[PDB]
Design a protein around this motif. Structure first.
Motif, PDB file in Angstrom:
ATOM      1  N   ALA A   1       0.818  -1.184   0.000  1.00 45.83           N
ATOM      2  CA  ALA A   1       0.000   0.000   0.000  1.00 45.83           C
ATOM      3  C   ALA A   1       0.850   1.230   0.000  1.00 45.83           C
ATOM      4  O   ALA A   1       1.909   1.263   0.632  1.00 45.83           O
ATOM      5  N   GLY A   2       0.391   2.237  -0.724  1.00 47.83           N
ATOM      6  CA  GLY A   2       1.156   3.481  -0.914  1.00 47.83           C
ATOM      7  C   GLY A   2       1.326   4.347   0.329  1.00 47.83           C
ATOM      8  O   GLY A   2       2.407   4.907   0.555  1.00 47.83           O
ATOM      9  N   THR A   3       0.256   4.444   1.130  1.00 44.18           N
ATOM     10  CA  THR A   3       0.358   5.011   2.460  1.00 44.18           C
ATOM     11  C   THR A   3      -0.074   3.989   3.518  1.00 44.18           C
ATOM     12  O   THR A   3      -1.144   3.383   3.386  1.00 44.18           O
TER      13      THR A   3
ATOM     14  N   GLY B   1      -0.843   5.275  -5.158  1.00 41.63           N
ATOM     15  CA  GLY B   1      -1.136   3.856  -5.024  1.00 41.63           C
ATOM     16  C   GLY B   1      -0.045   2.897  -5.452  1.00 41.63           C
ATOM     17  O   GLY B   1       0.744   3.179  -6.339  1.00 41.63           O
TER      18      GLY B   1
END
Ligand SMILES: CCN(CC)c1ccc2c(C)cc(=O)oc2c1
Ligand SMILES: CCN(CC)c1ccc2c(C)cc(=O)oc2c1
Ligand SMILES: CCN(CC)c1ccc2c(C)cc(=O)oc2c1
Ligand SMILES: CCN(CC)c1ccc2c(C)cc(=O)oc2c1
Ligand SMILES: [Cl-]
Ligand SMILES: [Cl-]
Ligand SMILES: [Cl-]
Ligand SMILES: [Cl-]
Ligand SMILES: [Yb+3]
Ligand SMILES: [Yb+3]
Lengths: 494, 493, 494, 493
Positions: free
Chosen positions: A442-444, A461
């Motif tokens: 996951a990007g964050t 993303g």
């Protein structure tokens, strides 16, 4: 409570904005814009299509020419123009928050305190970068002097969604303009009004004509025209994964324009037995229900360790039953409407699938009234990975809660999706926080919080939730084109 | 653990300048000893001011515009450093043995830690050489502006006796990677491994004058470096007291740039929720590694009241398991102190602890009939005003203290002119982050201690240091920034 | 100094390389590989297709799993493995240079002295980055600790051209592996052999199984399978702009995989009247004729200021008439063959168009010899912007020379193309060098030189010559995926 | 050029600590003068050691963990700096007038250059506040390592009299953007504009103790800053001689970090192919701007033989066009020197030039009946051993010299302990790059001179300085790097 607009909102800006002037659509056609809480028509807006996009791109191209004011002005002056624009938005904060609330079905307190503040801060952040974008000098092999220029790319087409119209507008134009690009912006059909007001401020701030152009209109017409245009250097899009695929395809088929995409998600949370339970309940709740669930990052799969699962569900249900549905301009209302009938229908359909597939309905599960597009806040427990509500992005106030016992297995389940926008991890343990956040695709990844977004950090993303990153230092890279210059010299010295 | 199959023969004992060996100008030599046995290993040329002057001239000449070292590809400076690493790897047994014998350093640690650290650090530095970059800058006005991150020039580097080889590499690796030339002054106690490395610098193919090594004493050769009018930068690792004198001499002479890595009195804070065995083990390692002779020694261990008695008990049990003797002898787990001066200072501080009412839990005196051995010593109920709580001991002497208030113990941990490092032991995320943020220390370890790597910057807050060594950030201190601003007819973004 | 292989080259590696083992094609099919100087068949190579790609991707995916050796080893150890690989290539330099020459139609001296040295140096450069890839700690608004991880992306599909098979192989795998990715490599159909030998060295170096997989085969089969694969995270492709478009399109249609492209060019040089004329003649000549014109960066439009034009042409023609055509393994030969009959035919066709459209043929202009694909070095003068030879990428030893009088106009002419890979500027004047290089829409601009490429500098195209950059610090970004981790804390301090 | 419509009233004359105005502890005050007229403008509180001590305590308190200044968003530090820039812009007429009156500075330059430079620099620094970032580092072993680029703490900042406002901002801008607290000592000659800025710092909303301003003398208040045991860093711009004393006191006291921007004797090299009028004009500006009172003054102009005579001719014509007088008077194009000590020193150096055989082309003596005016003076045929070729003059005195060999003139240009800046004039690419690379100077201008901007780092080589100010690189010197290394069970790339 908060300040409000003392006079009735008058809608003034409804036309296409090109070269700092207002234009009718080439076709003469207009489209209606609505208040989703009441279904009333607010006004008609000029309907931009391919021909209008073409005018805007010519204006943006001309403003980007070598020797033009925008190309030759000091980087610090681009910065100053952005800062000035932030000041103007701040000046018009009541007006813009009111307009955003009315048009977007957005709770006024959130519009005023979160959206407008986010806009202003993001613009000011971007302004600061303009004269701090730097290339390199490079100690290349041989008798050469090598340096790089981090040039603007050129004409950037920017397609903005309806869920955060003002914030997303700034998220796009801020970095693009800070880097020295020119832009053609296509706001969402549902929510063009705040963007057009901002265009009036862009002119007032003193941006040269053609640097920012705004073309309201529909996706398959104006949006498609942007994505396939032969003189647009870059397209940025935020919206559904399905449309993202079509943009990227059209980029490839046309002129190989650069592409950045911020798309859907099905973001998981993992709540360990040692978590601060109230904090986890509260953030996971906020993570799903903020802005009527209409967030790409919605915390739409909550995995809770067995031993705390029943209590987690119980507290989540209690928290979900406290809402008051209605007009987002009305004091005391704590949940507004969905943006339109298409979204409303899709959400209700997914809620039906949940019932049908055997998820346990803990509260809500249907519409509220006939006027505007209101959906009862809905919690499902005992959700399993194969259910539609566990797989498909809902974009509504629908929370899914699931149990796990094995940490290794739940990480696999969390990662078993084509999506990868964000995730949350709830634990007090250092080692777990670090190793789980590292393992999640996951990007964050948020730890003991959820939905914390800021201009200072890159956002975007993994996998089919996006291509590229927005904001922070890293996000600026995507609005520059790198040029290497290598100069022969008679002899180099270190 | 492979060993050297043949007896170590000492070959390199002279001053190394322009890739050649030189006797001292005065003719004087000094003895070098095995601190475990007190036997004299050899005599080494005693460099003084005149020898420093020759070295500086050589380094200056090698740094001249148009010279091989200035004109070669950055990637080739890197290649030379990688080659040097391969040669040190080839001579690993010899160097570890020599380091152990001369430095009183446990052979297994010399071979597995010091030599590996040396090789890895050099290879890390080699990789930076052609990745050091300046900037292009969008200045106001019609100008093209860029920066060059040039080498500074002639760097005088003064190396301590506790990690002679590692510290040598910590200095020359970044300096050379950046394109500087160097004049190195190894510690009087431990010049031998540096002189062997000099033979390898020549073998690797470095141009003459790029590395020069001048053995000798601090107040003579070291002072000459620090006050030299043609040295551009001095780097020193050692005591805070000498650090002050270096910085003063820099100011008085030619305003040479200064980096300093000095003493510490590094605290650990052990919370009630800590993994107790892990904390005991890392705090123990932190104070006792290499007979306590580490700038980063964990010399004040603050333990939450509710676990204090158990922490002390386990620490005492851990401290009583050592075997003292010759660090070349398998099975020995504690070597000697470096020399009689250190030995005396440590025994004096141990005496002050007894005198000032600290509780002596074990050890507390010398050991044996030959060499400089101190029994591993643990004091409990140490209070902040005691000499052992304030002064850097540099011996196998552990101080344990209690606290009840976290806010107060942070203040106590910070209430020192030192600030090299610290340790925090807790399972809690929030505590780990907020405590580490509040500590005035250059490196903060969480649930570990003494974890140092070439990839991370290292150095002190306050009087523990000026500047940082290693990592990306450390490389800055071996460059001098030049801004070049060119008038142009018109700029475009 | 030019050592040669003392023994006859024996071809040993001809199979598909997956999980550090050699595999027959799933279909059983094989394809022939040729010596372009002699037309003789060197061997048969396993013909990889979709099913083979699928096996390779599964292996690469497994090797990328959280907790695997490749994911858990020290970054410095990835670097060590790359350095070791460079040493092995250096050990096998004679063998590789000979094989590259024989299979690629590449002058042996260039293969040995340039390609192999470039390979070794590039790998060593990349090795040095492995443990110097770093994220950020970020002073976000609010009580949070935010950091970023620059993670590897995952499974990277890498499609390599036939013009610099070894160098391009390393240009791709070096950065990908340094960043911690796993790869599936598809070498060009014409030139798989050196890649397969490098695979044997990858195993010998000690890379874990599945980290590097190599699938020889054709473009529309194996290459297309890579570009549309649902479990490949990224595709990198060097080749024609036409195929680049299809890759980007397939990426969009399939799983939105990240895309980097290095495509064709029609790179211009601008030679001012004050230029060192011999230097400009020599570099422009090298720029066009290096490796029989088979470079994406070929200096294929040379614009020369009127007052020096006739002399420039004259010296260029003299320089072009000095070649000796023949077998690139033969000492004394200074020009080898084109890669294959398709290229050869295309080049001759474009030469015919030049004659037909009225360009002045100064020398060459036809084929040479009785065997292999040799084209005479050819110079055209009085070329105009609308001619095919001025617009289309030739990829052969064909030089175009044109005149200009107006600097402003010639910059427009230089930029008037969809291409933008590189350019050259020849002048002694500081201001001209800086302002012209700034104005040119090209990824690399050389000043008083041409074709100077190094691992230290980013390389890639503007416009339809590419997406993204390769090598240098900047190029490494494209092999990382940024993860933001944001941790709630009780109070932050600066 | 707008002007102040009302008479300037001096309001702020006291010591500024904790956002309050203080009398000096001793009760003593000192006079401040208009150098054009010699009239006394006012009396200012005379800060000394005791006042410095109060300021440092205030700065230390404001820097405490948990304080508003430490806990506020980095973006909010930025906002405060932007607000300060707006307030200076609001008070631009007042500040320009005051700067002109007190500093002997041409009003048009004060208004158009100094004030604009102040405002732009502050806005630049504001933008960095939330963009200062550390690193996450892929260290060997099972660890998570990150760095924090913390503020250093209490920064003592000593400001010169030549650019009081600009230099004030050059110091406090980056210091505050990074999160430090400051104790500022403006020059004895020119405290007034700084004290007005302090009023604006309060008005902007900076927390108390974040900025403190202590007027006074160098050997008293300045020396107290440099030797203070609780100041973490000192930054000084001024003479090389005082720079040495600051660095020495730093070493003797608490090893505080030091940045120095000192004198120069900056050379220009003018090649035969140069645009001659451009070179004459920039070299002229380079030496005569603000009555020659610039550290970067282009005080050695080396001109290729074949164009030397013409260069001198045109330089002399350019120097004879000035009108000397009160810098508030419209039409005046040259103001006074700052004080009698400078005036005397300049006249003495002009005498040495005559005595040592330099050719006096114009000027060469004082002017007028009041204030400290020196005729613009040009010397030709200057040789390297003359006092005027070696010593920093800090007056409107231009030295022109010839060369024939480029290699030799580079050596001559570099043959100095100074290294602040240099200029290179040529149309040739290769010459521009190779000459700029070979010069030992912090900033090298090509076909221009004196082009300074907030976007680029600025500072000296050799004895012209330690460290850099402004640009990205300058921000490093106002941070202290902390490495945090956390043990984890297993890492993944
Ligand atoms: C949601 C409506 N649809 C139909 C798939 C589309 C289709 C294509 C586009 C494109 C290319 C751009 C866009 O902005 O919206 C679209 C919308
Ligand atoms: C430890 C012996 N002493 C006396 C304090 C000193 C004094 C000064 C220096 C200097 C300047 C450099 C040095 O390396 O060692 C010293 C050692
Ligand atoms: C050589 C031209 N052709 C056939 C149309 C193609 C077409 C598509 C591809 C793709 C998608 C990947 C490739 O590697 O080569 C190709 C080659
Ligand atoms: C220029 C006047 N003098 C010499 C007494 C000094 C001497 C020392 C200092 C110090 C330490 C700081 C200072 O700011 O000014 C000084 C000025
Ligand atoms: Cl770059
Ligand atoms: Cl820089
Ligand atoms: Cl980042
Ligand atoms: Cl760092
Ligand atoms: Yb004895
Ligand atoms: Yb044909």
């Amino acid at each position: 409570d908060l300040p409000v607009l003392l006079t009735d909102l008058k809608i003034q800006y409804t036309k296409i904005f090109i070269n700092n002037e207002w234009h009718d659509s080439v076709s003469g056609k207009k489209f209606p814009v609505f208040n989703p809480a009441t279904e009333e028509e607010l006004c008609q807006v000029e309907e931009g299509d391919k021909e209008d996009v073409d005018k805007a791109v010519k204006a943006a191209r001309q403003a980007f020419q070598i020797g033009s004011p925008w190309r030759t002005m000091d980087a610090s002056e681009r910065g100053r123009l952005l800062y000035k624009l932030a000041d103007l938005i701040e000046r018009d904060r009541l007006l813009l928050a009111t307009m955003e609330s009315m048009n977007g079905g957005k709770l006024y307190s959130n519009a005023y305190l979160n959206d407008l503040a986010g806009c202003i801060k993001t613009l000011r952040y971007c302004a600061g970068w303009a004269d701090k974008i730097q290339g390199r000098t490079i100690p290349i092999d041989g008798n050469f002097f090598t340096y790089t220029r981090h040039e603007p790319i050129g004409v950037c087409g920017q397609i903005i969604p309806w869920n955060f119209p003002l914030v997303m507008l700034i998220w796009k134009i801020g970095p693009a303009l800070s880097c020295g690009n020119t832009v053609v912006v296509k706001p969402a059909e549902q929510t063009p009004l705040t963007a057009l007001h901002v265009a009036s401020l862009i002119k007032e701030a003193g941006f040269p004509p053609g640097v920012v152009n705004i073309v309201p209109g529909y996706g398959p017409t104006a949006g498609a025209a942007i994505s396939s245009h032969m003189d647009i250097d870059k397209v940025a899009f935020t919206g559904s994964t399905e449309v993202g695929k079509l943009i990227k395809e059209a980029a490839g088929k046309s002129n190989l324009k650069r592409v950045t995409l911020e798309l859907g998600g099905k973001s998981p949370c993992i709540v360990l037995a040692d978590a601060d339970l109230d904090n986890a309940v509260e953030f996971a709740h906020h993570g799903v229900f903020y802005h009527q669930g209409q967030c790409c990052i919605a915390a739409s799969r909550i995995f809770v360790e067995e031993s705390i699962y029943d209590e987690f569900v119980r507290r989540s249900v209690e928290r979900a039953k406290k809402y008051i549905l209605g007009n987002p301009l009305t004091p005391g209302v704590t949940q507004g409407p969905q943006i339109d009938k298409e979204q409303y229908d899709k959400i209700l359909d997914l809620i039906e699938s949940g019932k049908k597939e055997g998820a346990k309905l803990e509260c809500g599960g249907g519409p509220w009234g006939n006027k505007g597009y209101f959906v009862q806040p809905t919690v499902f427990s005992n959700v399993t990975d194969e259910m539609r509500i566990a797989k498909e992005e809902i974009f509504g106030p629908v929370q899914q809660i699931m149990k796990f016992k094995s940490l290794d297995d739940v990480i696999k389940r969390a990662n078993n999706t084509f999506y990868g926008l964000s995730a949350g991890v709830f634990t007090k343990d250092i080692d777990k926080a670090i190793t789980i956040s590292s393992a999640l695709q996951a990007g964050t990844v948020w730890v003991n919080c959820y939905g914390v977004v800021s201009a200072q950090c890159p956002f975007g993303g993994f996998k089919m939730s996006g291509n590229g990153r927005e904001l922070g230092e890293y996000g600026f890279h995507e609005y520059t084109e790198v040029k290497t210059v290598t100069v022969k010299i008679s002899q180099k010295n270190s």
